[PDB]
Design a binder for this molecule. Sequence first.
Ligand code: OHB
Length: 167
Amino acid sequence: VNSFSGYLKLTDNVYIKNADIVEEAKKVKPTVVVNAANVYLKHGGGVAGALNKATNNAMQVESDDYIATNGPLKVGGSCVLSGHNLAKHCLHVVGPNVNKGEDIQLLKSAYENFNQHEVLLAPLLSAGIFGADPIHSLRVCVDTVRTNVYLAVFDKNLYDKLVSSFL
Ligand SMILES: NC(=O)c1ccccc1O
């Protein structure tokens, strides 16, 4: 049993809810919250900007030190950093950004990072301002992630379309 509440069960391991991931993280304090990161860990907008704002910019300060030491992530890659006030850990995962022309086949590689963690609170990778089709992102998630994933979908209209169209 875990603390996640109000989710619709899509599969054995994937759950979904219309929720603000920031508000969900603050309530649950999950072991892992996933950030929709870019390779520079520049948390300007979308999910990343919202998570970073909720940490009072501490996520960005930590991320800048990580990049200064290690250099940029790979598209499809990840790193584990602090979850600050939101979670124990933040798994920063880089899905491909269609608005930068990145290979959508890298979305499966991005979701494979989730398999290193038994339970996660996450957004749909490459959705929102990353430009991918969220229906596609949910299909790749279900077909790639084997660990238990709780997906937060900010937009109620999109949530209802994801559920209604789910195969
Ligand atoms: N998932 C989001 O994009 C988000 C979440 C909280 C506040 C602003 C936001 O844009």
